[PDB]
Every structure is written in C-alpha cells, then in structure tokens.
Design a protein around this nucleic acid. Sequence first.
RNA 1: AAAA
Lengths: 431, 434
Amino acid sequence: EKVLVLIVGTNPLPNYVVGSHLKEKYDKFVLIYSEKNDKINQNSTYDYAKKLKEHLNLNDKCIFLPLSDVSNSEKIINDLREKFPSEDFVEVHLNYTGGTKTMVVHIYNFLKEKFKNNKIKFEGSYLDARDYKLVYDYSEEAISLKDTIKIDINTLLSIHLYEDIHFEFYDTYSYKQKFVDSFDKISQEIEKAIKDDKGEDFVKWLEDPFRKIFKGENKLLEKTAKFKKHIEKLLKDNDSSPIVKFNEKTPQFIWDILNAFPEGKKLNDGQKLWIPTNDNLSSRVKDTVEFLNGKWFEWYVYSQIKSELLDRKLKEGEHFGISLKAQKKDSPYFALDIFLINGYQLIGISLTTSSTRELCKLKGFEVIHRVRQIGGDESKAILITGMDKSKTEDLQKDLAYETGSTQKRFVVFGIDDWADIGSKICEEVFK
Amino acid sequence: NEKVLVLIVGTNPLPNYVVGSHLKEKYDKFVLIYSEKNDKINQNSTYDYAKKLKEHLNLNDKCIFLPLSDVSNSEKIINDLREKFPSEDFVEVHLNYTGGTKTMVVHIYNFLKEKFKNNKIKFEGSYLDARDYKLVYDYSEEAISLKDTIKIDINTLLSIHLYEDIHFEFYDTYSYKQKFVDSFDKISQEIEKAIKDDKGEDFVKWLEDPFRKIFKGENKLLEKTAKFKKHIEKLLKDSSPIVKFNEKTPQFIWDILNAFPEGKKLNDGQKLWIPDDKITNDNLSSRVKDTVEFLNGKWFEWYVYSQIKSELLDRKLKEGEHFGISLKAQKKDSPYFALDIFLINGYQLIGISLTTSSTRELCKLKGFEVIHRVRQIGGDESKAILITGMDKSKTEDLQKDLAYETGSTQKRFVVFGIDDWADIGSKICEEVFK
RNA sequence: AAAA
Ligand SMILES: [Mn+2]
Ligand SMILES: [Mn+2]
C-alpha cells in the first residue's frame, strides 16, 4: 500500500498537477485541509479538497483529513496524530506545495517520524511554480511537468469553484449570426485595414465622429425619437458637427468597412449618414454599432491567434476560446475576452481599442484580478490596447507586482502590435 | 552568550518586519536568508526586501545576509546553508519560518534543527499567523498576539515594499481649504449637514442631471467664455438642463450652492449664472472652476475623511503616520499611484477608494484598482475598501463579484454604497477595528 | 504571511 499526501491550500491548481502526474503510482490519497473557524479568521479549503477528489477521480482511495487550526503547530500535530490513517503503508509520499508554512513543516516532520521504519520509504516533493518542475527531496530527479500535464478550461474553472461555464468558438461566434452572409466580408475588410496599419486611423475615427453620433444617452439607438433629437443637436454645430465630419472626412477604407454590412444593417445611406420605428431602428443599427464600437477587435485578435494555436496542438474549446463567462455559486458572472491555456498555465487576454492612459490602466487591474480568481496565483494576464509603445511600457511598470519569478505575469501590447498580433502573442505565451 | 534570529526573506517583507520589530531587542545576530536572481530558472531575487529589512529594523552590523542560489532545490539550499550559515557558538538559534518558498522553509528548518540539536543550544521555530495576528512558537507552545503591540507607519510600510517619494495631505493642509479660503468650513459643513440628512442619493441624482450636463463638456469648457456661452445657448434651445437647474433644484442644494462665496457661486440668485460678454476667460474660470471640481466629486473625499478623523484620534492613531488623505508614491522610475485615503490599524494597511458614481461598470473598475494598489504597497494581507454611490444591491453584488479566497473569513475587499454615506464614519470604524 |  502506497499513499500520496497533498496539502490543500487555496491554490488547488498545483495539487491538481501533482496529482495528475502521480496518481497512477499510488493506492491511497490523503488530502489535508482546513476546517472553518470564523473566530480565528480561518476559512476552510474543504471545497477545494472536494474538487481535487472529483477531477482527479480518486473515489474511495481518497481520505480527507481536517485540521482545526492551520497556524498552530501544537494543534496541527495533535490533529495529525489523531486522524492520520494508521495503516501499514510501504511508501508515504508527501507533496508539500500547498498550505501554510506551519502545515508544511509539521506535516512533513510528523510523517517523516511516524514512518521512520526503513521498511517504509519516505519521499517529499514540491512543485516549483517558477520553472514548472516537480522536485524531489534529496533526489534531484527534477521532472519538468510544463509540457506533460494538461488541463482544459472547464476543469481549471471548476477546481477554482466557478460554474456555469460558457464561451464561444470561431464557428459559434455570435456576430456571425447577427450579420448573415456578410460577416466574412466585414471581418476581411477590417482585417485588411489592420494589416495595412490603419488601426490607429480607425480608432481615431471611431472616437470621432462615430462615438459622438452613435453613443450618447442610454437607449439612444433604441428610440427613433431620442436618436433624431441627438441628430438635430449635432447639426447645430454646423460645419463643426460630427455629422459633417462623418460625411466629408471619412477615409475610403472606412467607407468600405461600413458598406460591407448587410443592406438592412448599414449606418450610412450612400456616402452619408442615415437619418431616420423603434424596432426597425434597433434592427438596423444595434448590432452594427455594438460591433464597430470594439467587439470587432475581440474577433480580429482571436482570428489572428487561432492559426498559431492550431499548429501548436491546442484544442479550441478546451485550451482556447472567446467571450468566456462563469460564476461562483450565487455570485455575479465575470467576462474575459479571450482565454488560452499553455500546458497548465492560464493566459487571460483582455482587449481594448482605447489609447487613453486612465482607461487602459483600469482594464489592466481588471484582467490581473480575473485571471488570479479563475486560474490561480500563477496565471498570466495580457492587456492589448491601442496605446503607443511608450504608454504600454509605463503601464507595465505601473501595475507590475512581484511574486518571485523573473518573467512578467502582466504584459501590455499596443497599437503598433496589432498587425502582427498573432505572432506577438505566440512569442509571449510559449516561452 | 550570543543569540541569533533567522528570517526567511520572501516577497512579502511585512511579516518579517513585524517579527523582527517584536524580537529585535532579544537577539544579538540576525540572519536574513534571501534568494539570488537567476533567469534560467525564472527565479527573481528578494535581496531588495532583505536590504529594506536590515535598514528599517536598524540591524546594522548584527545583520548577516545569506544568499540562496536556488530556492526550489533542497540539495542546493542545504549546500548554501552548510557553506554560509554563521559558524560562531550560539546559545540560541530562533528560526521564524513565515517567509519564503515551502522548500526554503522545510530545509532551513530541518537544517538548523539538526545543526543546533545540542543539549545546551536552544532551538526555536516560530510562525506569524496572518489570520489572527499571532506569533506562534513550536517548542515553547506560546502564542502571542501582536495585533495591538506592533505598529508601523505609512512611510516605513511603503518603503519596505520598495515605494518612494511618498506624499499625502493632512486635515489642516488639505488643498481645497486654500481654493475656498474663509469659506471652506461653511461649504463643507452645509454638505455634511445634507449628507447626514440622507440627501446623498438626491444630491448624486442632481449632480448627474442637470449639474454635469451644464458644467461638463469639452476640455476647459469652464475656462473659455465662448465655449461656455455657446454650450449654454445650445442647452437653452432644448428638456433643458438650465430649466431643470432653475426650476427643479431642491432647497438643500440651493443651500449648498449659496454656501459658496458670492464670487464663487454657480448661481446668480435663484437662477443659473450665465456669463455676460464682459466676462473674460479669467473671470469665468475664477468664479466657477474650483467650485465645479469640488462639487463634482472632491467634496466626497473631504467628507469621508472628516467623518473618520475624530474616531482615529480617539483610538490614538497619529495623523500622517497612521492615516492621511491623497497618498501618492512610486517605485523607482515608475508611474505614481494615487490612493484617496489610507489608514493603518496596527500593521494592516486599509486603503480606501472613494467615488460618488452609481454606475456598476465604473465602480467595478475602481474596485479592481484599490485591490491591486493596496496589495502593491502594503502586501498580501492588506484590506481594500471601496466607497461608492451605488444602492445596497449593487454594493453587495460588487463585493461578491471581486471577492478572492486567501484562507480568511473576514473579507479583504469591502464595498459601501449610497445608503452608508450618512454614517460612513461608524461604518468604517466597525469595519476596520472589529 | 495557505505553488515565495
Ligand atoms: Mn475588452
Ligand atoms: Mn476617488
């Protein structure tokens, strides 16, 4: 009988990886977790322990071992002496990656002593987050797990206690349905413009005049009356009106983008703004305005990454996708623009066409927190912005947080990366 | 004779500073075990933290630095210890093993337990509990609460976390007290009176419409008379926020507006002041610019700060050391951060981010920001409070939305909303100190 | 300071 002992902290991912790699070699699994004691400010990791048992399919081979106090050696040793299985194991393997420092020292030294009898082989190991290696005590076996252990997005979110997972594929992208028969032409025209280095020109026009016409009061594009009132206000600026700029200063590559939309979903009438039924207005403008206001950039980047990832053995749906959402039980949903899994490292990618320092900064804080919540503390966050290189470098330094590794866990791309964004993400993710 | 304290320098310097402050006076030597930098194994150095610890604990020549080449490798760790741990005769070796990787902990603990297993050398190990603020001993079985005994100031806290060029304002040096000299107290007391009268939600509604419709447009709208008068003529033709200002403004907001000096009033009597053609750009800016920026959000900063100041002094916190307004600092050659209010209870940093906004999306972004900031400057056990203008339901949603599990039952991200403004002083007091 |  051979037993593997895992220490259940609040990062289930390392225990999942070690367990996936070693489960075949063991007959019993002891998951050591914390009880909830509100009066010493101690939450339980039982919920993680259950998820580990569940996704590692341990079933009847799993023993759960609760510790009443994970900060007190005395009580830790007391609970171990009382509760640790007293069977005649021939090998006891403790992986001491998870948990508090005291849990580690005292579980380690408890087990080494309890099983000192040389009929029993004691082994300790540790999953190194920096170099993706399982290191054994005194053995220098040093096996890299970086490329060997895989996880899909459903398992990753599940062990971090997220549920109701939804995302989209290239074949299920929602705007492909909203723009029937025209999506490909639309996305081609946009991809052509970005590859021709017109992204900055595009975002400038989107900011002015596009957002000045089609973004104002809430439900502006849902009530024909409110929209015409907005049109007549802007016409008061005369030659300085956004409408005049729309009609007279729009570049040909933007007219071609606008004219790629289906006849009944175009913002223009000839080379002129369409000046207006509420449901007929919504059917004409709603999806088109929402797509042009930024969703297009989500699709563009996703289609640039897909190719590279297909060559790399990743499986769409399991290892990458677009428009990820999920929730903890009875809790609000998050939204992440693009996810990618390299081995067992989550890379969350957040996209904005903004060039403004303040807005991109806030999006940075957001993507850092989300990948931590859903993929754990060793996840990578990428922010793709419309900022110049100087601003992206500042933002990287501004939000950098130190965790002991030499590689950045928060990376910022900018307007000059848009044309070759697939290659830039390939380089950054697969290092 | 000689007694040595051993500390493991991870990337969270605060625990080590706290254990060191508590035990400094009882030890003759301090060994700071830190990591070396090696890009091949993706391993950064914690030397910068070790050096801040030596500095801010005033260790001087009693400090021995001990570098580890590889903090994931038991054999290299033991080798480095064998070669670099001081060889003098010690009567006591105390290892506090709170910091570092788990392999650092296990092998440093066991290396020292073995090396100093003599009958007359006292070996001790301790652990600082982040959850109940207890220094816990392995062999003596002591458990000593440090929550109220160990203190730290904002300058020391930010410095050990590698921040520098620290600035902030005092109650008596607050910036708007100069822009409304002779009138600040009257203005803020009128606002305070209304917010304490549960007019918060009404105030914010009015600020959104019509106040922000009239006074928030193009950049420098309120400093160019032509831009402002054009803007007003456009609004007048429309209904009009000018009509709503003149006809639908509640009495308590007239009382706030009328608390400003006459030359800083937005109103001309019981109507909106409209600049005449004789009004220069300077006249327009001098009348309106500071008043508008205050009413558009800055007032909230002063309001919340003023509601907690007496409570903090009553708890013997020292302004400037343990609390303050408009904190800014930076890492070397890096952009500055801005934090609306900071507070320090014992050694836990509380950062408070304020906004009058009631929109979910904006309040969520500010939530992410204060979470990250207090982590950067105060470490992993800091608390972030976000005070918004949202209703209770949106405030509760946002707390659960951004909640992150680190093993504690007390939340380290707290959100307050419009319903909390009238008693925000006691709300923060109960939240922070209980 | 519960994969530093
Ligand atoms: Mn986005
Ligand atoms: Mn604020």
